[PDB]
Enzyme design. Structure first.
Site, PDB file in Angstrom:
ATOM      1  N   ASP A  13      24.172  31.630  81.742  1.00 19.50           N
ATOM      2  CA  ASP A  13      22.982  31.502  82.583  1.00 19.50           C
ATOM      3  C   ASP A  13      22.509  32.876  83.041  1.00 19.50           C
ATOM      4  OD1 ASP A  13      20.997  30.780  84.288  1.00 19.50           O
ATOM      5  OD2 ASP A  13      22.325  29.933  85.843  1.00 19.50           O
ATOM      6  N   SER A  49       5.095  39.569  81.211  1.00 18.31           N
ATOM      7  CA  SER A  49       4.438  39.283  79.948  1.00 18.31           C
ATOM      8  C   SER A  49       2.989  39.755  80.005  1.00 18.31           C
ATOM      9  CB  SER A  49       4.502  37.780  79.669  1.00 18.31           C
ATOM     10  OG  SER A  49       3.745  37.408  78.531  1.00 18.31           O
TER      11      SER A  49
END
Length: 330
Positions: A35, A199
């Site tokens: 994770d 992004s």
């Protein structure tokens, strides 16, 4: 040193991925959910409330000659999906894919919430976010990667998750045969303890690319892709009959649909998520309403590039002095 371990979807939907991890002496192999959105290595154990164990493999520290109680240490964690677990702490030898750390904090669960009990395939979590998020008190502990870093050939790990197939976590090296083209690296903020990056935009299907900054986290422990409501609405508007369902808890779409791809930007590069990766199947057995793999982050407080996005790429978690993320197509 290096390590290399195969990671395997837990079910036919890729709801999560499990990677075998050796703990203790003699080894006890548990299948952990790696994770990158959390920083605790915790396991089902011989200390876990018996009624909360349902098929998981447990760590028994009393059977490990290298286990040592970390005296006074406790831990307690709550995840974004509302699940939680807590317990005490041992140090022990932990190996992943041939890479060994001695003295790793292994957090032994005394209590786990119902969603953990109900998932017999996940024996615990192995956190790979920054150690500043580790919950052990009163002495915060380091992640497996942080402990291994100085020994690694290069201070990196990579995630290569498969679509409906196994993939690989590598530590200490970049497998140049595992991706196509080049790796595009992008800046990371560690201020929230995550692999947080920006992004450069998105496209839906064959549509034009929208240049827009989307701050979010690379999170292997989250199944879906959670993005701003504007972006998510633009995606699902291209699917006839798709709608946001308050009762189901997100966007659903007719199971008869063919889904468009979704592209996200990494600098000037582009990662394409095929439409099929966005199908999470019937909302309930036999239903013709299917659950979408791109959902709004509006209720979260952060955008999450979960498995839906990461499995479309070869992803480098670069733990150099200034961390960065790398993405390549594959």
């Amino acid at each position: 040193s290096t390590g290399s371990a195969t990671t395997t979807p837990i079910d036919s939907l890729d709801d999560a991925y499990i990677t075998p991890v050796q703990i203790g002496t003699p080894a006890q192999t548990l299948n952990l959910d790696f994770d990158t959105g959390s920083s605790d290595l915790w396991v089902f154990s011989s200390e876990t409330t018996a009624s909360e164990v349902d098929g998981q493999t447990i760590y028994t520290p009393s059977k490990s000659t290298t286990a040592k109680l970390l005296s006074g240490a406790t831990w307690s964690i709550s995840y974004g999906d509302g699940s939680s677990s807590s317990g005490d702490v041992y140090t022990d030898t932990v190996s992943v894919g041939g890479l060994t750390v001695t003295g790793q904090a292994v957090e032994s669960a005394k209590k786990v919430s119902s969603s953990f009990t109900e998932d017999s395939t996940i024996d615990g979590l192995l956190g790979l976010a920054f150690s500043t998020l580790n919950t052990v008190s009163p002495t915060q502990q380091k992640t497996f990667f942080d402990n291994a870093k100085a020994s690694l050939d290069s201070p990196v790990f990579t995630a290569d998750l498969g679509y409906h197939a196994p993939g690989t976590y590598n530590f200490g090296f970049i497998d140049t045969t595992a991706y196509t083209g080049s790796i595009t690296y992008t800046a990371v903020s560690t201020k929230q303890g995550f692999w947080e990056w920006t992004s450069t935009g998105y496209a839906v299907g064959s549509g034009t690319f929208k240049s827009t900054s989307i701050d979010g986290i690379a999170d292997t422990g989250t199944t879906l892709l959670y993005l701003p409501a504007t972006v998510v609405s633009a995606y699902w508007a291209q699917v006839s009959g798709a709608k946001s369902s308050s009762s189901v808890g997100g966007y659903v779409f007719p199971c008869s649909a063919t889904l468009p791809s979704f592209t996200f930007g990494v600098g000037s590069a582009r990662i394409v998520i095929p439409g099929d990766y966005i199908d999470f199947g019937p909302i309930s057995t036999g239903s013709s309403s299917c659950f979408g793999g791109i959902q709004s982050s509006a209720g979260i407080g952060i955008n999450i590039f979960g498995d839906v996005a990461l499995k479309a790429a070869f992803v480098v978690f670069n733990g150099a002095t200034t961390p960065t993320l790398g993405f390549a197509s594959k």
